[PDB]
């Protein structure tokens, strides 16, 4: 097995026991005045330079995952936008480190861009480490939810009057377009953070997916994943699959 196998099961099975949070970062359809809102109108390309050093990273990441033994007929559109949104969900994930003064290197996190049957583009996070306790799950879904909103406002591309623009800013709050994993509950009640094992959860779940290499997507298929030590980024689907094999 060549060394990327190898250094990402080891990597990963280090971590197999690991408490993590686990997120989504989506978006929904919205219609203001007439004007669609839909799940790619976020196509600005913001000239910040850590934003354009992370949209570089989403990239090449999908670049040397590529693999180019099949063809791949993905929209333009489509990948572009996914790029711009590993970038700002980044963004949001980095901006609460440092609330927190988190020093990156302290920090385990997976990111996985996917297609849902029903809701289309989302982001699954996991994320934790030493600093990181149950306790402090729902503080981190909201101030991840206001940055991700604020982003989202500021990279739309669709012409907004500023009293559109914060409806759609207060949209994305309201209706929890960062959602955080919890047990199951019924309405009135309580929840609790459900945290999950981060090596298992990626090896025995995210890593089996099938890779999306149409448009339309296939439903449930993954486009592009990452993590804090640059393992699993560029590697094809096959190897993908190789390391849950090896991972058990
Ligand atoms: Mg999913």
Not at 35 to 57: P, T
Not at 126 to 136: M, R, T, V, Y
Not at 164 to 172: P, S, T
Request: with cysteine; glycine share 6%.
């Amino acid at each position: 097995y060549s060394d990327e196998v190898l250094g990402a099961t080891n990597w990963l099975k280090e971590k197999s026991n690991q408490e993590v949070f686990s997120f989504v970062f989506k978006n929904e359809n919205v219609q203001l005045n007439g004007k669609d809102i839909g799940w790619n109108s976020y196509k600005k390309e913001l000239q910040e330079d850590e934003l354009k050093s992370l949209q570089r990273g989403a990239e090449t990441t999908w670049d040397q995952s590529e693999d180019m033994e099949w063809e791949t007929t993905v929209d333009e559109m489509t990948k572009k936008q996914v790029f711009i949104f590993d970038s700002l969900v980044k963004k949001c994930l980095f901006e609460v480190l440092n609330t927190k003064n988190i020093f990156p290197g302290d920090v385990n996190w997976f990111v996985q861009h996917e297609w849902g049957k029903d809701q289309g583009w989302h982001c699954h996070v996991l994320i934790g480490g030493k600093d990181f306790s149950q306790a402090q799950g729902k503080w981190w879904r909201r101030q991840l939810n206001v940055y991700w909103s604020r982003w989202l406002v500021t990279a739309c591309n669709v012409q907004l009057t500023p009293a559109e623009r914060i409806k759609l800013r207060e949209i994305a709050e309201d209706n929890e377009w960062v959602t955080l994993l919890t047990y199951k509950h019924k309405q009135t009640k309580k929840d609790y953070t459900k945290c999950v094992l981060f090596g298992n959860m990626i090896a025995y779940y995210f890593l089996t997916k099938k890779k999306i290499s149409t448009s339309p997507p296939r439903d449930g298929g993954y486009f592009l994943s990452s993590d804090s030590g640059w393992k699993t980024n560029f590697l094809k689907e096959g190897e993908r699959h190789l390391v849950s094999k090896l991972y058990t």
